[PDB]
């Protein structure tokens, strides 16, 4: 229903994380990633597939990626860690 391909991400503090969240539908009425992290967009052709470009990763976050397919609201998260010396 909603797939996030980079599920297991390791990346240090401050860098950028590429998150790819799409749905298993043909018409994503309402789709987005819920996090308070800065992101513009990443260019990707196709009305279904989608990449947000997250940046300035400081702490451990679990963003939720909804998708309003015509069978209810769906849910998919991703798991990301940080690094420190």
């Amino acid at each position: 229903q909603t797939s996030v391909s980079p599920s297991k991400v390791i990346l240090p503090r401050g860098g950028s994380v590429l998150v790819t969240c799409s749905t298993s539908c043909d018409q994503p009425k309402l789709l987005g990633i819920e996090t308070p992290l800065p992101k513009k967009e990443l260019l990707l052709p196709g009305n279904n597939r989608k990449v947000y470009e997250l940046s300035n990763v400081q702490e451990d976050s679990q963003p939720m990626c909804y998708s309003n397919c015509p069978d209810g609201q769906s849910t998919a998260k991703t798991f990301l860690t940080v690094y420190w010396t």
Partner: protein
């Protein structure tokens, strides 16, 4: 004998047709009817009956008889007592009510809803409880200075022990849908301690409250479909 011509749509079996058919039991003297009480003439006679909302369907208390009583106390917090969207066919706590089960056979619905709230505390427990309905398209109300601005009702506790918060038909479309749709979203509903609930000594502090749902007499449905409870 008679010149006829066969149109398209001949020799089809449509599952919603209305045709005649030869009776396989000719001259069957049917059993004469008697006046059985409680005859239903319309499925909207069943929408106008109250039925409890599983409002307390949190992790642990769901799927048991603690799903219905809403927790109350005497502390008088600013937090909402409950909060629920107005989607009586696709919300996780409304689609299993008697109104919610009929709406999952239909697709488009209009009309206003009726929330009758029974207070099941003690006799000496007096209090005031705000009951609010906010139309959609803004911030979901969390504090009391956000839900006072909508359609609300301030309810007092005492002898007459059941209020009625009405959620009116305020909608862009003539017919909202029976799914979680963004364009036909219903509204935001909260419930705040107006002043607080006060108990004396020798009286329980933590109490409960029951929550109902029915349909106003301008409530009507269309477009019969299958449901999504059973398989």
């Amino acid at each position: 004998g008679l010149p006829t011509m066969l149109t398209p749509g001949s020799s089809q079996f449509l599952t919603s047709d209305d045709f005649q058919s030869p009776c396989a039991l000719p001259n069957f003297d049917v059993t004469p009817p008697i006046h059985i009480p409680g005859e239903v003439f319309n499925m909207m006679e069943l929408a106008e009956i109250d039925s409890m909302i599983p409002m307390n369907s949190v992790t642990g208390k769901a799927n048991t008889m603690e799903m219905y009583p809403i927790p109350l106390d005497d502390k008088g917090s600013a937090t909402p007592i409950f909060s629920i969207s107005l989607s009586p066919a696709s919300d996780k706590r409304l689609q299993y009510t008697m109104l919610g089960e009929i709406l999952n056979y239909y697709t488009h619905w209009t009309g206003s809803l009726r929330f009758t709230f029974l207070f099941c505390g003690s006799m000496m427990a007096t209090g005031k409880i705000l009951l609010s309905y906010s139309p959609p398209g803004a911030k979901p109300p969390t504090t009391r200075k956000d839900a006072m601005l909508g359609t609300h009702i301030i309810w007092d506790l005492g002898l007459q022990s059941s209020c009625t918060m009405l959620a009116p038909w305020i909608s862009n479309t003539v017919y909202r849908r029976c799914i979680k749709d963004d364009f036909t979203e219903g509204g935001y509903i909260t419930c705040f301690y107006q002043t607080r609930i006060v108990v004396p000594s020798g009286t329980p502090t933590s109490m409960f409250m029951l929550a109902f749902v029915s349909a106003c007499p301008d409530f009507s449905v269309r477009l019969l479909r299958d449901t999504n409870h059973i398989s």
